[PDB]
Write a protein that binds this ligand. Sequence first.
Ligand code: HEM
Ligand code: HEM
Ligand code: M85
Ligand code: M85
Ligand code: H4B
Ligand code: H4B
Ligand code: CL
Ligand code: CL
Lengths: 362, 362
Amino acid sequence: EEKEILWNEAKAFIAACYQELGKAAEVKDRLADIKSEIDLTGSYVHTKEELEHGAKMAWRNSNRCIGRLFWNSLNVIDRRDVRTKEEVRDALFHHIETATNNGKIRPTITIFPPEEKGEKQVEIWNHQLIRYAGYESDGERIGDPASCSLTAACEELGWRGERTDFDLLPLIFRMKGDEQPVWYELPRSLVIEVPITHPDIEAFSDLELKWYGVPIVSDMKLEVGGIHYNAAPFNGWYMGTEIGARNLADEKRYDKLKKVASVIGIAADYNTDLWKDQALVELNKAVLHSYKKQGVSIVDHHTAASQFKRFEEQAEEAGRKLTGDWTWLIPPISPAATHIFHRSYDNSIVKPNYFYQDKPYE
Amino acid sequence: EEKEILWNEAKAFIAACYQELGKAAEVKDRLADIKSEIDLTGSYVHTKEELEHGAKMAWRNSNRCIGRLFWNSLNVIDRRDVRTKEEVRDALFHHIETATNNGKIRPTITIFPPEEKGEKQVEIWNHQLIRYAGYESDGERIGDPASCSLTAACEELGWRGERTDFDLLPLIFRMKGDEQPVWYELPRSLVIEVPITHPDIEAFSDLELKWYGVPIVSDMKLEVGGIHYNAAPFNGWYMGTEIGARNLADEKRYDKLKKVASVIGIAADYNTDLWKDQALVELNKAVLHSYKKQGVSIVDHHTAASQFKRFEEQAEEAGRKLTGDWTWLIPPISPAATHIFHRSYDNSIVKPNYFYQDKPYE
Ligand code: HEM
Ligand code: HEM
Ligand SMILES: CNCc1cccc(OCc2ccc3ccc(N)nc3c2)c1
Ligand SMILES: CNCc1cccc(OCc2ccc3ccc(N)nc3c2)c1
Ligand SMILES: C[C@H](O)[C@H](O)[C@H]1CNc2nc(N)[nH]c(=O)c2N1
Ligand SMILES: C[C@H](O)[C@H](O)[C@H]1CNc2nc(N)[nH]c(=O)c2N1
Ligand SMILES: [Cl-]
Ligand SMILES: [Cl-]
């Protein structure tokens, strides 16, 4: 019966997509072919053009994303042809290499074969292709706590971390028909890392903080015209606050504020001193300074908000409703200094889009 | 017909109120009397006990308020007896004096006669009893822009501001049957002001910033058991960010960030320098430091969030649903460093409560 759901989502997408591509006349025939294909086969296949535009539309419709101004320049890599775990591995490696681009990050998505009967062809376990492991035995806390469950799942499969605070997790994914996923260590030559130093405070390096260059989100499902691409990792470049105000600052993450306060030479004893706030700002300055110094792309939250304002304006000129999630759009540092804070946003879900899916570990 | 709306709201309130007061048995008879009073007169009158508890419940139910831990210690001044503008004026003066308490601020509400037929007995035009005027003629911007419309309305009525950046607006309110409101200049002896200095940076005083001690919100309607108290000004003490991150920082308010950056000696040229963020933190440190130094009550956003966590815990122990507006509960400075940021809140409206009402100017 599900052909009905597939059919409607397809009608809606193909009409919108071809309309945007200036190919409004080619719809009826393309729709005919699709209608025919669904009946005969239960599914349908996107042309490279449709798939590329769909991934772009999905980014455009991501309510929680401040970086959407650049939706139309997304680099879409079509890998629906992969059949083996060696090919999947090599596609993931290539994505890291091409997206990184020696530091001048290209927003990229690699698209693997979609679900057929709801059955996945490829199931990626990583939350991001590049991320640090996390450990928690008796009392001892090492690495990134957000990574504890995946780290434990990897160690079940024969991987073993060095237990530094910045162990790179291996790529881990499962192929249809395989009962267990496989894992592959990342070639360190592929992964750019940035040591965190401060522009003015030389002691900042005593913290020995670092972070990876490219956030490549690998556990969300891309949905385009009723077709479910559960494996489709994508990346942009970082907004500094993600690293400096969350990954490094959150108590349930690296929890570094008290250490930052020490090296910048302020007391961490009184709330009224705003020592957490001062620490957040210096930490966030350091992160932007370091990435810039190393020639790795990054955006600050003010510039990012200015760009998003241009996205709003562009949406309006094009006659498209704007949707957004205010609670995710505001940055976690000085939100009221951005225009985002002072307006509201319609949080409706429009497709094509990216969605959460259940973790196979946990 | 409206007696029906009044009756239900009354049943709901009296049951909840007396239940909380340990007087659950006295409900049936109190309800009987009320039912009788509504039929005979169209309305009913709160006992001092009911009114006091209702105002407290209203504060408890204010989704946007982070300061709710202290709901039960609200100082309720019952002024339903006032009939003249001299009495209203003197009640407003007294509120300022008693709430201020030489700097050790008492959360206070003064309650004036409620609406009868929807007809107001007293209509207060001030947004806060103490606030600064704002002006905008050709090019020239003086004072608080948020006050422009009320300032213009006052100047229509014969008041004239000195046009400093911190002119105190007069009290302005209208009595039933009067066509125009009256206005009275505030005795400067009643109004505590705090010069903003910085703990470490002596040049900060060159900005000549100041703010008033007590925010007394005077344009919201208190609703208790179907009874509409449109005139019921209330106050707490300030959370520093309200002054330092909004009143003084917002571009549409005093817009001081660029001037702050100059006196603290950092460039205001590059977004990646996070100069706005650094300025916000120093400005906010200054505000807390100044209030504390002068012996005027104030809370920082971290301590305030810790208190609100205790409010959540207390709500749970008492078996009361918690409601809140995340978008107003998070502070505008380092929101992710508070627990509030990392949870969600049911934004349902529960009565008794405080509500917006239309401005008579504008
Ligand atoms: C080009 C630079 C980009 C920047 C600076 C950027 C910035 C951000 C930020 C800061 C968030 C919030 C993340 C969080 O708070 O955890 C976000 C969310 C998101 N971004 Fe972007 N982004 C960029 C590119 C992209 C691209 C290329 C895509 C997909 C094609 C994308 C899709 C999303 C999605 C789906 C979310 C929400 C994820 C969720 O619900 O957890 N973004 N973005
Ligand atoms: C005791 C110290 C108090 C503190 C520190 C405090 C803190 C705050 C803050 C920071 C806000 C947000 C204001 C904004 O962003 O514009 C707020 C909102 C509010 N507070 Fe409180 N508050 C306190 C006492 C009170 C009292 C005594 C009442 C009433 C009896 C009250 C009722 C409210 C209401 C109704 C709002 C929302 C106003 C609106 O929707 O615009 N608060 N509070
Ligand atoms: C673990 N946090 C929840 C969760 C679950 C799944 C995906 C996700 O992604 C957040 C996200 C997604 C895309 C991004 C693109 C660029 C960027 N700089 N950050 C980005 C951050 C976040
Ligand atoms: C002009 N801003 C919108 C608007 C309209 C009407 C009332 C209001 O009040 C905000 C408010 C209310 C009560 C408060 C109590 C204590 C406090 N420190 N701030 C407080 C701030 C805000
Ligand atoms: C309506 C819009 O979301 C707007 O930014 C609101 C919400 N957030 C806020 N939060 C606070 N503390 N104060 C405000 O005035 C506002 N304004
Ligand atoms: C669900 C809850 O409101 C929680 O704080 C959310 C919303 N705000 C957020 N905003 C960002 N940027 N990132 C997050 O992970 C979250 N978490
Ligand atoms: Cl991240
Ligand atoms: Cl205020």
